């Protein structure tokens, strides 16, 4: 029990883009109560071996931080879709079009332009004018929020228990609201 | 993420659009407005505004004393504003039945 | 009316036609934003309330 | 009580700002960038039970 704990699974909030609280993997447990010590040792050997991988994986993959479940991710931790600039070839030599049409020719259809060699292209940026910050998206949520192995659970001092496992915990206030 | 992608919370159009388009929109609001085609979120303030202690929005008081003379009537109320509350006196009125 | 006015009772009502009744999902019933504070205050995290 | 209606033709009309071809090309270039996606919400946003 206390020393080969079941990991806490992180639930997700796809609206906000944040963890939604956590509770243990109740949904994946080997029923050993009709085995003996010769095989319970092997089942514990598997459950121990799982927790080693979760600890290794959290250190490899998670962004090291002062809080589980922070309410707002800085624009340097959020992954951003920053494509290259987009270039377009402008379809008319506009200054020569006013010249030619003021001369009384009519221009219709279309690029090409037989009467002028001038082309121009301009290269706008495509990127969001400000970097995004706030919630994390689902492919980053899985890169964060590896399950939590929690040894000797609830043994420290209250007020540095894992309060943000609790779903309805207001980490901006360290408090808990009802329905109003 | 989906509240940010759908513009239910997060950045305004003048923040999330490319800077080329924002200067274009500004330069043409007269005479070809793009300013109804992009969602800006609006978001209520979640902290420091409303309490979540149990507490009445409206109080009714009854006269602690009253006088009923030939030409006028008096009533005395102990208007009690409790701790951590404030009363804009514009919200008060005397409710008379007769 | 008059000095022969009969004994009487009073009847009270209102009408409110093109309206709809509203009840905002807000920690007090003011509109402080389109995304109300209860709509983002711990009815989010699993929640699932009936 | 005898009412009826008969559609003899439906035709679709569309009006354009007669915009300069380099400007309209530039505006399209900007509006095809993924961060410049347009968005709308139904004015009565509700589920009509």
């Amino acid at each position: 029990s206390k020393e080969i704990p079941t990991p806490y699974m992180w639930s997700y909030q796809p609206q906000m883009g944040l963890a939604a609280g956590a509770s243990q993997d109740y949904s994946t447990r080997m029923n050993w109560l009709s085995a003996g010590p010769s095989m319970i040792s092997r089942v514990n050997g598997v459950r121990n071996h799982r927790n080693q991988i979760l600890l290794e994986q959290a250190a490899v993959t998670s962004t090291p931080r002062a809080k589980l479940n922070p309410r707002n991710w800085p624009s340097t931790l959020v992954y951003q879709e920053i494509p290259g600039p987009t270039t377009v070839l402008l379809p008319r030599d506009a200054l020569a079009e006013v010249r030619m049409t003021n001369s009384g020719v009519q221009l219709a259809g279309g690029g090409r332009s037989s009467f002028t060699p001038n082309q121009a292209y301009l290269t706008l940026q495509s990127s969001s004018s400000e970097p995004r910050s706030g919630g994390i998206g689902t492919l980053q949520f899985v890169e964060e929020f590896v399950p939590s192995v929690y040894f000797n659970p609830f043994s420290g001092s209250p007020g540095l228990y894992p309060d943000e496992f609790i779903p309805n915990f207001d980490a901006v206030r360290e408090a808990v609201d009802g329905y109003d | 993420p989906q509240w940010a992608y759908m513009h239910i919370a997060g950045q305004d159009a003048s923040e999330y659009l490319s800077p080329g388009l924002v200067q274009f929109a500004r330069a043409t609001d007269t005479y070809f407005s793009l300013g109804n085609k992009f969602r800006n979120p609006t978001v209520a303030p979640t902290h420091d505004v409303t309490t979540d202690r149990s507490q009445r929005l409206t109080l009714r008081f009854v006269p602690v004393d009253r006088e009923d003379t030939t030409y006028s009537y008096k009533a005395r109320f102990t208007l009690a504003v409790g701790d951590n509350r404030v009363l804009d006196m514009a919200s008060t009125y005397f409710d008379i039945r007769g | 009316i008059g000095q022969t006015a009969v004994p009487s009772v009073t009847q009270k009502k209102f009408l409110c036609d093109r309206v709809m009744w509203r009840i905002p999902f807000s920690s007090n019933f003011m509109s402080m934003g389109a995304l109300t504070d209860l709509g983002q205050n711990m009815l989010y995290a699993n929640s699932a309330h009936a | 009580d005898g009412a009826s209606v008969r559609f003899d033709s439906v035709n679709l009309y569309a009006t354009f700002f007669p915009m300069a071809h380099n400007t309209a090309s530039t505006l399209e270039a900007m509006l095809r960038n993924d961060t410049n996606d347009q968005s709308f919400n139904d004015y009565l946003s509700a589920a009509n039970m």
């Binding site: 270039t87 001038n118 082309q119 121009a120 292209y121 301009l122 290269t123 706008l124 | 305004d12 159009a13 003048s14 080329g20 924002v22 200067q23 274009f24 929109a25 500004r26 330069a27 043409t28 609001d29 007269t30 005479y31 407005s33 300013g35 109804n36 085609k37 992009f38 969602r39 800006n40 979120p41 609006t42 | 309206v19 709809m20 509203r22 389109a34 | 400007t23 530039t26 919400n41 004015y43 009565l44 946003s45 509700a46």
Partner: peptide, 27 residues
Amino acid sequence: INFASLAPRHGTRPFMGTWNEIGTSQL
């Protein structure tokens, strides 16, 4: 009896707006 938000912003000389900075590579 329901809500939407429209996102306009502004700026012109007593003239009219042509658009701004050209990021052009020319020929």
